[PDB]
Amino acid sequence: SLSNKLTLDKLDVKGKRVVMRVDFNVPMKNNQITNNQRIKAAVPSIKFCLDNGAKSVVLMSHLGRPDGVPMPDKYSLEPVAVELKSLLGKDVLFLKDCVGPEVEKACANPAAGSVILLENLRFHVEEEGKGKDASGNKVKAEPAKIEAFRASLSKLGDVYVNDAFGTAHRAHSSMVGVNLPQKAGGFLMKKELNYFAKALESPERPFLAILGGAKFADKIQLINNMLDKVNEMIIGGGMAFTFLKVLNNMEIGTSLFDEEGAKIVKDLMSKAEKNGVKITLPVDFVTADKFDENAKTGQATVASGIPAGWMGLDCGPESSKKYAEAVTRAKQIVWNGPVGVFEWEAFARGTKALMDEVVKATSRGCITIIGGGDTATCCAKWNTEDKVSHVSTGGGASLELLEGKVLPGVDALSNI
Ligand SMILES: Nc1ncnc2c1ncn2[C@@H]1O[C@H](COP(=O)(O)OP(=O)(O)O)[C@@H](O)[C@H]1O
Ligand SMILES: [Mg+2]
Ligand SMILES: [Mg+2]
Ligand SMILES: [Mg+2]
């Protein structure tokens, strides 16, 4: 359940040390942060702790994939501590490790109101439980070292807050290994729990799922699970061509196609019919002569077919009308996956037009939830993060939730 987890607002932090896992995995161009959003996002949790008289706030995170080896001049969090100070208006004590006796002494009983950022968790193989040595070979953490790693993290506070929903699908040390009596979701985690509880436990109706992206093979379980929650489903993006080729016998040219997933399209459509789910597929396309931002473009319908050698990189205007009709009917929407190659302007109109509709939907009271890595990048890209109900911070984690899985980091939180 996503509905019964302890959260920071219900957690007494007065005079307690708070060890908080956050997502500070920000984009970097050589030691400079290019987007400080993920850091801004954690500030509400940090400031709440400080305002309610926390003795300290100890922040732990990862950055990149150092794969269990210290890489302090490629993947240090040091830049984040500078950025954080600016955003908080408070000194951040940065430590060059996250475990060991020197860290623990820094964290044992600090000055009331202290904010500390530990070095990258993934410099230790014990965080992920595996990684790679400097020759690229597998290494596997030892049980005893995992234990000591997790014990050392657990020394750094009295209560644990997880505000790192984007890592909650990993059973890593900082997510599941912190042995403290109260383990609470932070304010970011709470929002993710509350909205996805709407998507999965008690949705407003009609409930529409908009599913796009590139690869049908990676969407099978997402589609199957959402078919037990929703009243309607839009299928777009690259995976729509697998459906269209099978069901209509469409000529799809060199559009994405999954020979294996094709063998279960009929099975998915059957389940939609058994559950009463109305499926909206695209009916027209913007085509491209190659998979390139400056491709020549054309137009196609299911009836016309896509020219041999050409690929469908976006839906067309009649698809955008059919899509907008389903959005008009919804009282709740979860959208995972753009409906065309939104990175490139000639193939982004369908995704932008659909976003405009989701924004208008929200205005009249629709609950609108964006999942995904790329669908969230879409919101950031057209500055629509505040014009929908919820943009998820966890790409892979939101997808596994929507697939029906239990997230180890969520499961590890205290109940009640
Ligand atoms: N018709 C299409 N053909 C090829 N790629 C597409 C098409 N429509 C969307 N995409 C691609 O899908 C990618 C997003 O897919 P995915 O990773 O599955 O979404 P998310 O990360 O939100 O779950 C984008 O890079 C986009 O360019
Ligand atoms: Mg993606
Ligand atoms: Mg992600
Ligand atoms: Mg529990």
Numbering used by the authors: 1 to 416
The authors write:
Phosphoglycerate kinase 1 (PGK1) is an ubiquitous enzyme expressed in all somatic cells that plays a central role in glycolysis where it provides energy in form of ATP through the reversible phosphotransfer reaction from 1,3-bisphosphoglycerate (1,3-BPG) to MgADP in order to produce 3-phosphoglycerate (3-PG) and MgATP in the presence of free magnesium. PGK1 is a monomeric enzyme of 417 amino acids formed by two distinct α-helical domains of equal size, the N- and C-terminal domains connected by a hinge region. The N-terminal domain binds 3-PG or 1,3-BPG while the C-terminal domain binds MgADP or MgATP. Two different crystallographic conformations of PGK1 have been already identified: the partially closed conformation, able to bind substrates, and the closed conformation, the catalytically competent state.
V216 belongs to the loop 214–219, close to the ADP-binding site. The rearrangement of this loop has been suggested to be important for the enzyme transition to the closed conformation upon binding of the two ligands. Indeed, in the wild type structure in complex with the MgADP ligand the loop assumes two conformations, promoting the reorientation of K215 and D218, now ready to interact with γ-phosphate of 3-PG and D65, in the closed conformation. In the V216F variant structure in complex with MgADP, the loop adopts the same conformation as in apo-PGK1. Replacement of the valine with a phenylalanine keeps the loop in the apo-like conformation since the aromatic residue tends to stay buried. The lower mobility of the loop hampers the transition from the open to the closed conformation affecting the enzyme catalytic activity (the kcat of the mutant is 1.9 s-1, 45-fold lower than that of the wild type). Conversely, no variation is found in ADP-binding. In fact, as shown in Fig 5, the residues directly involved in the ADP binding (E343, G312, A214) and the Mg2+ion bound through the β and γ-phosphate and D374 preserve the same positions as in the wild type structure. In this variant, the introduction of a phenylalanine residue reinforces the hydrophobic interactions between the 211–219 loop and the 243–263 region thereby stabilizing the C-terminal domain. This local stabilization, which decreases the flexibility of the ATP binding site, is sufficient to determine the decrease of about 50-fold of the turnover number with respect to that of the wild type protein.
